[model samples]
Target: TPIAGTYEGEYSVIELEADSYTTDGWLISINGVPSSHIVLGQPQALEFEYMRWIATGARAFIDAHQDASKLRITHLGGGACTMARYFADVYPQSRNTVVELDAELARLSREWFDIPRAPRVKIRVDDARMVAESFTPASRDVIIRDVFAGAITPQNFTTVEFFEHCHRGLAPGGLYVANCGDHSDLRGAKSELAGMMEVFEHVAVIADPPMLKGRRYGNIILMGSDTEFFSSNSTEASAITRELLGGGVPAQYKDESWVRKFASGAQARHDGVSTLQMP
Candidate 1:
């Protein structure tokens, strides 16, 4: 039977079921919503299309900007620590810290996922924004935000102030990668882009053509960095773009110019404001 037991966490009821096909693969769901997929001993087998995009972006950006061998990464969500596991395996010298709010979920993830421990992948039980604010300036090479509450990313995480905190935490030329979900109208997406633009020197986005064209609701990978990634005509940028297009789940990279255009006329979210809709 592939049915894994349901676990009641402090925040939600999480379920972990083994993949029907793969012996070691598992799918993690929170409150009945599938959140992440993991393969116990195969970090490179990224099951989600969006995660593959994230991996491609991380590999290219880190290789081009930072020391690929000794990468320092901060993850603002610890859903099964999938990305962290992938990084620890892919970058043998990488030091990763994952921030998770639910202690029970964190404990369960460690127990079941066999996630690496401190010095390689440290799982911290704390609020994502609080952990983000605690980072030493310029200490991290990359800060990735994958936190979500149901379908919406908590409002605070998308605010300009929150992004400013992440910007301050990253090393010069470091990358800030976020996995954001948005509707067809793109209001939330634009606001997030605007917020990131206020803090970083350059910004880019990766999504499928349909998602970008307002045809459906899906995940958008937003990226910010002091250094350019896709805009520049460098070899790294060209190769990354080519690879993204050639991949099984092909995606497109929007340059800084496209970001500016898309975010234009959109109000950047702030700390004190409250909005009702999903963000």
Candidate 2:
């Protein structure tokens, strides 16, 4: 459940005002602007300003897949349902299911944010891993794994078994994207990267300049799929990247070599990591 608290001051990020508030346990932020001075939870804003980058990533997935009509997408996290709302608005025919562990979080989002409702977007109160387990094989065309508990993501969500579940849930030609946060050194990043590698044939990473330079505090979008669509198909990938940059959102595809470089060591730990139970 999302903690409840009072609104604090504001935090600014590149012109975007993130509303700072505090849930009893964690800090909360919304749309990069601080909420009014009122009782709230920790002032950790969810920061939807970064959502542009996520939208761009989603666009990349849609481009790579080349089909949006009748598409099925499953979001492992539903903070304010930002990405889910974008997808619903962008692709009216697409069916989206957002899974969240905290029912209160979903309720609070409805009360505070103008999140879209069912049909176009549906919310499921359940653990991401559990929902993934119950999904039929190849059930979804796109899967976005962005589950997090405050600043830290659950260890279970970073395991090989969890990624394997995602792989199983993806439809052929489907794409999976994850938002992973870490310090500049990328100390524990390798393990999760390696986990994705174990389940998908092609993998790419998208991050800002600071993240690329190893600076922390931000987020990185990692993508994986069984097809070589984003790779060998450099023309399309480059064009999309260029367009995204034009929109002031910068992103890049990690070549095969770079992917291997980041995940090789972590891949070696597959057997040692605990496997997650399927729903």
What TM-score fits each model?
0.92, 0.75
Instruction: Note the clash tally of each candidate.
Output: 0, 37
- Clashing pairs in model 1? none
Candidate 1 local lDDT, 1-279, one digit each (tens): 234889889998989888789887889999898888887767777767778788888888887678967789999995778889889888888998898888988887678776777778888899889877777789898998998633768888999999999988998889999998887788888899989888999998887777777788788889999897666466666777786776566787777888898889998999875656896
> How many angstroms is residue 170 displaced in model 2 relative to the true structure, after the best TM-score fit?
1.1
What's the lDDT for candidate 1? 0.83
Whole-model lDDT per candidate: 0.83, 0.64
The numbered model that scores best in lDDT is: 1
For candidate 1, report its TM-score.
0.92
